[PDB]
Protein backbone atom coordinates (compact mmCIF):
# COMPACT_ATOMS: atom_id res chain seq x y z
CA UNK A 1 0.00 0.00 0.00
CA UNK A 2 0.81 3.72 -0.02
CA UNK A 3 1.90 4.63 3.52
CA UNK A 4 1.26 8.24 4.60
CA UNK A 5 4.42 10.01 5.78
CA UNK A 6 2.24 12.13 6.15
CA UNK A 7 0.92 15.44 4.71
CA UNK A 8 2.68 15.68 1.33
CA UNK A 9 4.60 12.37 1.52
CA UNK A 10 3.80 8.68 1.06
CA UNK A 11 6.07 5.63 0.88
CA UNK A 12 5.51 2.36 -0.99
CA UNK A 13 7.17 -1.02 -1.42
CA UNK A 14 8.89 -1.78 -4.69
CA UNK A 15 6.48 -4.51 -5.86
CA UNK A 16 7.71 -5.14 -9.41
CA UNK A 17 8.61 -8.86 -9.57
CA UNK A 18 6.29 -9.73 -6.69
CA UNK A 19 3.36 -12.10 -6.43
CA UNK A 20 0.14 -10.47 -5.27
CA UNK A 21 -3.45 -11.33 -4.39
CA UNK A 22 -6.39 -8.99 -3.96
CA UNK A 23 -10.13 -8.73 -4.25
CA UNK A 24 -11.77 -6.64 -6.95
CA UNK A 25 -15.15 -4.93 -6.54
CA UNK A 26 -17.11 -5.38 -9.74
CA UNK A 27 -19.28 -2.27 -10.16
CA UNK A 28 -22.50 -3.05 -8.27
CA UNK A 29 -21.39 -6.68 -8.43
CA UNK A 30 -19.68 -9.19 -6.15
CA UNK A 31 -16.08 -9.17 -5.06
CA UNK A 32 -13.86 -11.31 -7.32
CA UNK A 33 -10.52 -12.84 -6.22
CA UNK A 34 -7.30 -12.47 -8.18
CA UNK A 35 -3.71 -13.62 -8.03
CA UNK A 36 -0.90 -12.67 -10.30
CA UNK A 37 2.52 -11.28 -10.88
CA UNK A 38 3.51 -7.62 -11.09
CA UNK A 39 5.57 -7.17 -14.29
CA UNK A 40 6.30 -3.46 -14.47
CA UNK A 41 5.67 0.01 -13.08
CA UNK A 42 5.05 2.63 -15.80
CA UNK A 43 7.58 5.52 -15.76
CA UNK A 44 5.16 8.24 -17.02
CA UNK A 45 2.64 7.21 -14.35
CA UNK A 46 4.41 5.43 -11.48
CA UNK A 47 1.18 4.43 -9.73
CA UNK A 48 0.21 2.30 -12.75
CA UNK A 49 1.39 -1.33 -12.69
CA UNK A 50 1.22 -3.96 -15.44
CA UNK A 51 -0.02 -7.29 -14.07
CA UNK A 52 -0.34 -10.85 -15.33
CA UNK A 53 -3.00 -12.83 -13.45
CA UNK A 54 -2.79 -16.62 -13.25
CA UNK A 55 -5.15 -18.13 -15.83
CA UNK A 56 -5.90 -14.87 -17.63
CA UNK A 57 -4.23 -14.16 -20.98
CA UNK A 58 -4.43 -10.34 -21.07
CA UNK A 59 -1.93 -8.07 -19.39
CA UNK A 60 -3.79 -5.54 -17.21
CA UNK A 61 -2.93 -2.04 -16.03
CA UNK A 62 -4.16 -1.17 -12.53
CA UNK A 63 -3.29 1.52 -10.04
CA UNK A 64 -2.97 -1.11 -7.34
CA UNK A 65 -2.43 1.28 -4.41
CA UNK A 66 -5.00 3.92 -5.44
CA UNK A 67 -7.88 2.22 -7.29
CA UNK A 68 -10.77 1.90 -4.87
CA UNK A 69 -12.08 -1.28 -6.53
CA UNK A 70 -8.98 -3.11 -5.21
CA UNK A 71 -9.32 -4.58 -1.72
CA UNK A 72 -7.30 -6.72 0.70
CA UNK A 73 -4.20 -6.26 -1.45
CA UNK A 74 -1.57 -8.75 -0.31
CA UNK A 75 2.05 -8.68 -1.48
CA UNK A 76 3.46 -12.19 -1.00
CA UNK A 77 7.01 -13.16 -0.02
CA UNK A 78 6.94 -15.73 -2.87
CA UNK A 79 10.02 -15.63 -5.09
CA UNK A 80 9.36 -15.84 -8.83
CA UNK A 81 12.03 -18.02 -10.43
CA UNK A 82 14.41 -16.24 -12.73
CA UNK A 83 14.56 -19.01 -15.30
CA UNK A 84 17.23 -19.11 -17.96
CA UNK A 85 15.02 -19.71 -21.01
CA UNK A 86 15.09 -22.90 -23.12
CA UNK A 87 16.67 -21.08 -26.04
CA UNK A 88 17.65 -17.45 -25.54
CA UNK A 89 18.64 -17.23 -29.21
CA UNK A 90 15.29 -18.48 -30.52
CA UNK A 91 13.43 -16.19 -28.09
CA UNK A 92 15.43 -13.08 -28.95
CA UNK A 93 15.02 -13.31 -32.71
CA UNK A 94 11.28 -13.93 -32.32
CA UNK A 95 10.99 -10.33 -31.06
CA UNK A 96 9.53 -7.75 -33.44
CA UNK A 97 8.31 -10.43 -35.85
CA UNK A 98 4.88 -10.78 -37.42
CA UNK A 99 3.46 -14.24 -36.73
CA UNK A 100 0.55 -16.54 -37.43
CA UNK A 101 -0.67 -17.83 -34.10
CA UNK A 102 -2.92 -20.87 -34.27
CA UNK A 103 -5.73 -21.26 -31.76
CA UNK A 104 -8.51 -23.80 -31.90
CA UNK A 105 -12.23 -23.21 -31.49
CA UNK A 106 -14.70 -25.10 -29.32
CA UNK A 107 -15.57 -26.70 -32.67
CA UNK A 108 -12.06 -28.16 -32.70
CA UNK A 109 -11.47 -26.42 -36.03
CA UNK A 110 -8.40 -24.28 -36.58
CA UNK A 111 -8.44 -20.53 -35.92
CA UNK A 112 -5.35 -18.69 -37.12
CA UNK A 113 -4.65 -15.19 -35.83
CA UNK A 114 -2.12 -12.77 -37.30
CA UNK A 115 -0.05 -11.18 -34.57
CA UNK A 116 3.14 -9.43 -33.63
CA UNK A 117 5.58 -10.59 -30.98
CA UNK A 118 6.51 -7.45 -29.09
CA UNK A 119 8.98 -8.40 -26.37
CA UNK A 120 9.98 -10.96 -23.81
CA UNK A 121 7.92 -10.21 -20.70
CA UNK A 122 9.70 -8.70 -17.70
CA UNK A 123 9.95 -10.93 -14.59
CA UNK A 124 8.32 -13.98 -16.21
CA UNK A 125 10.93 -14.04 -18.93
CA UNK A 126 9.97 -17.35 -20.59
CA UNK A 127 6.69 -15.57 -21.50
CA UNK A 128 6.24 -13.09 -24.38
CA UNK A 129 4.14 -9.96 -25.00
CA UNK A 130 2.08 -10.37 -28.15
CA UNK A 131 -0.79 -8.50 -29.80
CA UNK A 132 -3.11 -9.30 -32.69
CA UNK A 133 -4.19 -7.39 -35.77
CA UNK A 134 -7.84 -8.30 -35.05
CA UNK A 135 -7.49 -7.90 -31.25
CA UNK A 136 -5.06 -5.05 -30.47
CA UNK A 137 -4.68 -5.52 -26.73
CA UNK A 138 -1.62 -6.85 -24.94
CA UNK A 139 -1.49 -10.64 -24.42
CA UNK A 140 1.12 -12.85 -22.80
CA UNK A 141 1.91 -16.51 -23.54
CA UNK A 142 4.73 -19.09 -23.35
CA UNK A 143 5.16 -18.85 -27.16
CA UNK A 144 8.16 -21.24 -27.33
CA UNK A 145 5.74 -24.02 -26.52
CA UNK A 146 3.48 -22.89 -29.39
CA UNK A 147 6.45 -22.61 -31.70
CA UNK A 148 7.76 -26.13 -31.02
CA UNK A 149 4.30 -27.64 -31.40
CA UNK A 150 3.98 -25.88 -34.77
CA UNK A 151 1.17 -23.57 -33.65
CA UNK A 152 3.23 -20.44 -34.21
CA UNK A 153 4.75 -19.50 -37.54
CA UNK A 154 7.14 -16.59 -38.04
CA UNK A 155 7.07 -14.16 -40.94
CA UNK A 156 8.76 9.24 -28.81
CA UNK A 157 5.05 9.83 -28.20
CA UNK A 158 5.09 8.45 -24.65
CA UNK A 159 3.32 10.89 -22.33
CA UNK A 160 1.07 12.27 -25.08
CA UNK A 161 -2.71 11.94 -24.92
CA UNK A 162 -4.78 10.02 -27.46
CA UNK A 163 -8.42 10.24 -28.50
CA UNK A 164 -10.18 7.27 -30.07
CA UNK A 165 -13.38 7.72 -32.10
CA UNK A 166 -15.79 5.16 -30.63
CA UNK A 167 -18.44 3.59 -32.87
CA UNK A 168 -21.06 5.38 -30.78
CA UNK A 169 -19.54 8.65 -31.96
CA UNK A 170 -18.13 8.98 -28.48
CA UNK A 171 -14.49 9.82 -27.82
CA UNK A 172 -12.22 7.76 -25.60
CA UNK A 173 -9.20 9.47 -24.08
CA UNK A 174 -5.98 7.71 -23.11
CA UNK A 175 -2.26 8.13 -22.51
CA UNK A 176 0.64 6.63 -24.44
CA UNK A 177 2.58 4.78 -21.75
CA UNK A 178 5.24 2.73 -23.52
CA UNK A 179 7.28 2.52 -26.70
CA UNK A 180 8.02 -0.96 -28.04
CA UNK A 181 11.84 -1.24 -28.18
CA UNK A 182 12.00 -3.70 -31.06
CA UNK A 183 9.54 -1.49 -32.96
CA UNK A 184 9.53 2.20 -31.93
CA UNK A 185 6.47 3.15 -34.02
CA UNK A 186 4.37 0.77 -31.90
CA UNK A 187 3.10 1.91 -28.49
CA UNK A 188 1.13 0.72 -25.44
CA UNK A 189 -1.87 2.89 -24.62
CA UNK A 190 -3.92 2.96 -21.43
CA UNK A 191 -7.46 4.35 -21.84
CA UNK A 192 -9.23 5.77 -18.82
CA UNK A 193 -11.96 3.46 -17.53
CA UNK A 194 -10.42 0.45 -19.27
CA UNK A 195 -7.88 -1.83 -17.59
CA UNK A 196 -6.61 -3.42 -20.85
CA UNK A 197 -3.37 -2.25 -22.44
CA UNK A 198 -3.96 -1.29 -26.07
CA UNK A 199 -1.24 -1.68 -28.67
CA UNK A 200 -1.15 0.45 -31.82
CA UNK A 201 1.19 1.56 -34.52
CA UNK A 202 1.04 5.33 -34.17
CA UNK A 203 2.60 5.69 -37.63
CA UNK B 1 -3.45 -25.57 -29.93
CA UNK B 2 -4.53 -23.06 -27.26
CA UNK B 3 -8.17 -22.12 -26.95
CA UNK B 4 -9.27 -18.52 -26.86
CA UNK B 5 -10.65 -17.33 -23.52
CA UNK B 6 -13.77 -15.45 -22.64
CA UNK B 7 -12.65 -12.40 -20.69
CA UNK B 8 -14.38 -9.87 -18.44
CA UNK B 9 -15.60 -6.46 -19.54
CL1 LIG C 1 -6.08 -12.51 -38.35
CL1 LIG D 1 9.79 -3.30 -25.34
MG1 LIG E 1 -5.19 -15.43 -41.66
Domain count across chain A: 1
Q: Which of B1, B5, B6, B7 to mutate to test the interface with A (most CBs of A within 10 A)?
A: B1
Q: How far is A27 from chain B (nearest CA, A)?
A: 11
Are the beta carbons of B5 and A103 separated by less than 8 Å? no
3-class SS string, A76-112: EEEECCCCCCCCHHHHHHHCCCEEEEEEECCCCCEEE
CA distance A141 to A103: 12
Q: What is the separation of C-alpha A109 from the centre of its chain, rounded to a whole number of angstroms?
A: 28
Q: Which structural domain range is residue A55 located in?
A: 1-203
Report phi then psi at A87, rounded to 5.
-145, 100
| CATH number of the domain encompassing residue A166 | 2.80.10.70
Task: Name the experimental technique.
Answer: X-ray
CA distance A186 to A47: 23
CA distance A162 to A46: 19
CA distance A15 to A17: 6
A194 contacts in chain B (CB < 8 Å): 9
Amino acid sequence: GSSHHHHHHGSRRNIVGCRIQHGWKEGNGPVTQWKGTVLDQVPVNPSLYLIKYDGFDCVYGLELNKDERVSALEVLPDRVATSRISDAHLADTMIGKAVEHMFETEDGSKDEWRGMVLARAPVMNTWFYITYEKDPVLYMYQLLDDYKEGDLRIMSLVGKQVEYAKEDGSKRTGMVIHQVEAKPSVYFIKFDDDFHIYVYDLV
Amino acid sequence: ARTKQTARK
